[PDB]
Amino acid sequence: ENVQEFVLKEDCELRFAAGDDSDVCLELVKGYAEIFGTELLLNKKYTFPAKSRVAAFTWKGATIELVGTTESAYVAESTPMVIYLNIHAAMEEVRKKREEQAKAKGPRLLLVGPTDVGKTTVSRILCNYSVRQGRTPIFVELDVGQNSVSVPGTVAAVLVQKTADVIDGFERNQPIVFNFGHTSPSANLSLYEALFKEMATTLNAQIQENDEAKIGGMIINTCGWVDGEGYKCIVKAASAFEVDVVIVLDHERLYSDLSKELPEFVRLTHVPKSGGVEQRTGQIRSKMRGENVHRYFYGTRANNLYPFTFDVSFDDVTLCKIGTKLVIMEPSADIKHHLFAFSRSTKADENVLKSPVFGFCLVTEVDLEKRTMSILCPQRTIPSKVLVFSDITHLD
């Protein structure tokens, strides 16, 4: 009902947050603009829900209308968008170079830095810019806490063939997903490292069978754990994925240490975080983990998913738990509200540890006498009889 109009000069961005209680609708009415790398269509009404934090940027200039109550809304004039564009340009240069030398292996890029420096946002911008160049990069998500590919407690990778949806983010077209089972790597650091090594190995063999994926390269998002044992995760991730480029966002000490340790062929670039990045408390982060899990089963406002609830006999499945090796679980009251991954491993053995998963279900009830559990499931029947425990819980 309330309306706000904004004139954006070239290289400026409108930053706003929808109110606690209401939606905010955004409309580009003149010029060109993009939201984290996805182009906006002239005069299309993009409805953002409450709490949404959004930045619309323009290279040449724009006029933009907001309809609805906003908590905040302003035009910033000095972003690092050019920096983030030049990273894409230099990445596409390496591709051409290696195409002209040739199948060409695309460049691989690791984004690092502490919490709330914009690693996820920059990874999104770079993926989008690659797609708009006509490339299909692989997006690799190592953040088991704040995960934009699958549920929390996963390490995942997806081939990006379309720009992110402005409101909903990227389409998850058949991701490779590994069940780590915890919201931080420190819960079991050696399993975490084993998982991204198996991810790296799987991706290298798969890109051999798909040339477009191969030359698309990789954009690898890490978590904000940069201190202590988080630092060694970074070095081992760089090594395991054989990255060509490390982008450090807003941590000059991390930059300095990485400069001294990484192999000489690795190009390291320090860039600042955007002034629009917002700090998020642990309470907000937990809420976002819950909404991620919710979305996995139910989808979005734009694209609803319709999950099934049904009963499963304990005589038809084997529950197991990593942690470090495999252990067979007895159906218990304490599995209630937990996610379980459907393992691609047919037996509950050593294969389970480094096997990707089909997907997840949520245990909603446990009937011990009847020896049944109620599960929420994206499909009608279980895709596997080997269900692997995750410590991620969700009340629905």
Annotated binding-site residue? 269: no
118 contact, one of ligand ALF, Mg ion, ligand ADP, none, CB 5-8 Å limit per kind: ligand ADP
115 counts as binding ligand ALF under rule CB under 6 A: yes
Contact segment (CB under 6 A) with ligand ALF among 19-27, 113-121, 304-312, 346-354 equals: 113-121
Contact status, residue 169 vs residue 249, Cβ threshold 8 Å: no
289 binds ligand ADP (CB under 6 A): no
- Is residue 281 marked as binding? no
Q: Which of 120, 128, 179, 343 binds ligand ADP (CB under 6 A)?
A: 120
Identify which of residues 20 and 100 has a Cβ nearer to ligand ADP in the complex: 20
Among 278, 291, 311, 367, binds ligand ADP (CB under 6 A): 278
Given ligand ALF, ligand ADP, Mg ion, none, residue 321, with its beta carbon under 5 to 8 Å by kind, binds none
> Is 163 flagged in the annotation as binding?
no
> How far is the C-alpha of 26 from the C-alpha of 67, rounded, in Å?
7
364 is in an annotated binding site: no
- Could you say whether residue 250 binds ligand ADP (CB under 6 A)? no
Q: How far is the CB of 281 from ligand ADP (least distance, A)?
A: 12
With binding defined as CB under 6 A, does residue 276 bind ligand ADP? yes
Q: Per rule CB under 5 A, is residue 120 in the interface with Mg ion?
A: yes
Least spacing, CB of residue 49 vs ligand ADP, in Å: 13
C-alpha closest to that of 292 among 150, 157, 142, 177: 150
Cα–Cα nearest to 40, from 172, 163, 170, 149: 163
372 is in an annotated binding site: no
Query: Under the criterion CB under 6 A, does residue 271 sit at the interface with ligand ALF?
Result: no
CB of 227 to ligand ALF, least distance (A): 12
Residue nearest to Mg ion (CB): 120
**Which residue is listed with tokens 């991701």?**
175
Q: Give dist(CA 178, CA 386) in Å, integer.
A: 14
Residue number with CB closer to ligand ADP (56 or 195): 56
By CB under 6 A, name the one of 54, 142, 223, 392 that touches ligand ALF: 223
**Amino acid code (one letter) for 354:** K
Q: Would you say 153 is a known binding-site residue?
A: no
Binding residues for ATP: 13, 53, 116-121
> Could you list the residues that contact ligand ADP (CB under 6 A)?
15, 53, 55, 115-121, 146, 224, 274, 276-278
> Could you list the residues that contact ligand ALF (CB under 6 A)?
115-116, 119-120, 143, 146, 223-224
